[PDB]
Structures are given as structure tokens and as C-alpha cells.
Design a protein around this ligand. Structure first.
Ligand SMILES: *C/C=C(C)/C=C/C=C(C)/C=C/C1=C(C)CCCC1(C)C
Length: 227
């Protein structure tokens, strides 16, 4: 076919593939057991994004959903990707500040609701209900951010400054990048259709890559990962 944003899918697959190998390589030359924990988790995040980007580049994970008088193109492979990568990122932040089991389970659960309702909204045919789902998905997100900001940050103070300070950088990159997603969804293909798919795809890879490979790098090159 050759859709305009394939170029962006091509750069997403590429960046994610590099990050994967570099983390893999760096992670298997590490003997520390906790370092090993963070490395296994993080190195798992980019490959999952890689395959989902590949398929899309190659033509899968796309479906035409009717609404607005149009047959709209929704890249659902995007959710099959985030469903597994967002909770692995949360877990990565949660292990850092020694979050409790209830917090994690709730952060991950809340995270399950967000990608699920978001997907249901991306699939919904009554135009206005799409925004209802989008609404529930976003509120689930605000709960997660509130927890990362209010809860986690507090427990990171029971950690060394090197640890509390690697966390606030990662928590900040997460608050800023996550904040953007619901807005992209809104003004683009899933929502208003103001921003065309090709610019939306570009916006999405820039965030996906910053939030994954960007997040991983900062985390795995830190000394705070060591037990
Ligand atoms: C590697 C991928 C990351 C860090 C993805 C983060 C994705 C989000 C924070 C997505 C959020 C969404 C909403 C708040 C509502 C509408 C639909 C979503 C799934 C785009």
C-alpha cells in the first residue's frame, strides 16, 4: 500500500530494535541479582514494541472503524503493545522505591483498565461514546500518575539520594510523556480527526521511543538499580 506514516513505523521498528539489543547485551554482562531484575524487565519492553511496530509496518494491527461519516483507520496493534509495556514500566518504577504489593497490583490493574477502555473507545461506533470511553481511560491514567507522584515519590525518600533521584527523573519523564498520550488520541484518528494519521503516527513513535528506550537508558545506566 505505502501509507504516509509507514516511514514513521520504519523508524519506530528501527529505534526499538537497537534499544533491545543494547539492553540485552548490557544486561547479560551484569552479575548483580537486582541489576538483573531491572534489566530483565526493561529489556523486555523494547522488543514487544518492536514486533508490534513491525506488524503495523507490514500491514497488521489496523482496522477501519466507522464513525463521523468515515471509515476510520485505527491502529489497534498499538494497544496490544502498551497493554504489556506500560505495566512493565510501572513495575520498574515500583521496584525502585520498594512499593508495596497492594500498590503494584492496583497500579497494574488501573493500568489494565486504561488500555482496555481506551481500546474499546478506539473501536466504538457511536462517535460520542468513543469520548466517554476515552474519558474513563484517561481518569484511570490520572489515578496512576497521582500514585506515582504522591505515593511512590514518598517511599523513594526511604532510599539513598542516588536512588530517590533516579526515580524522580524517571517519574518526571513518565508524568510528562504519559500526559501527552490522551491528548494525541483526542485530536487525531481516534478522536477529532484534526491531526492526520501520519503526524499522529510520528507523535506516537516519538513518545513511545522516549518513554521506552529513553526510560530504559536512564534507568539501566544508573547505579540505583544495584541491590
Ligand atoms: C511505551 C508506551 C507507553 C509509556 C504508553 C503510554 C500510553 C498511555 C499513557 C496511554 C493512554 C491513553 C489514555 C489516557 C486515554 C485514551 C487512550 C490511550 C490508551 C491512548
Amino acid at each position: 500500500t505505502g501509507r504516509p506514516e509507514w516511514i514513521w513505523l520504519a523508524l519506530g521498528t528501527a529505534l526499538m530494535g537497537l534499544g533491545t539489543l543494547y539492553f540485552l547485551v548490557k544486561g547479560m554482562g551484569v552479575s548483580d541479582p537486582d541489576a538483573k531484575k531491572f534489566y530483565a524487565i526493561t529489556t523486555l519492553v523494547p522488543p514487544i514494541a518492536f514486533t508490534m511496530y513491525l506488524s503495523m509496518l507490514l500491514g497488521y494491527g489496523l482496522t477501519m472503524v466507522p464513525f463521523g461519516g468515515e471509515q476510520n483507520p485505527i491502529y489497534w496493534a498499538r494497544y496490544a503493545d502498551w497493554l504489556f509495556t506500560t505495566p512493565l514500566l510501572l513495575l520498574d518504577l515500583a521496584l525502585l522505591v520498594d512499593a508495596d504489593q497492594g500498590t503494584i497490583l492496583a497500579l497494574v490493574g488501573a493500568d489494565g483498565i486504561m488500555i482496555g477502555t481506551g481500546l474499546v473507545g478506539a473501536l466504538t461506533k457511536v462517535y460520542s461514546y468513543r469520548f466517554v470511553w476515552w474519558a474513563i481511560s484517561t481518569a484511570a491514567m490520572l489515578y496512576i500518575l497521582y500514585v506515582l507522584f504522591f505515593g511512590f515519590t514518598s517511599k523513594a525518600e526511604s532510599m539513598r539520594p542516588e536512588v530517590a533521584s533516579t526515580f524522580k527523573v524517571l517519574r518526571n519523564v513518565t508524568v510528562v510523556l504519559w500526559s501527552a498520550y490522551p491528548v494525541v488520541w483526542l485530536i487525531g484518528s481516534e478522536g477529532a480527526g484534526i491531526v492526520p494519521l501520519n503526524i499522529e503516527t510520528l507523535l506516537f513513535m516519538v513518545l513511545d521511543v522516549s518513554a521506552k528506550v529513553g526510560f530504559g537508558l536512564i534507568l539501566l545506566r544508573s547505579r540505583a538499580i544495584f541491590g
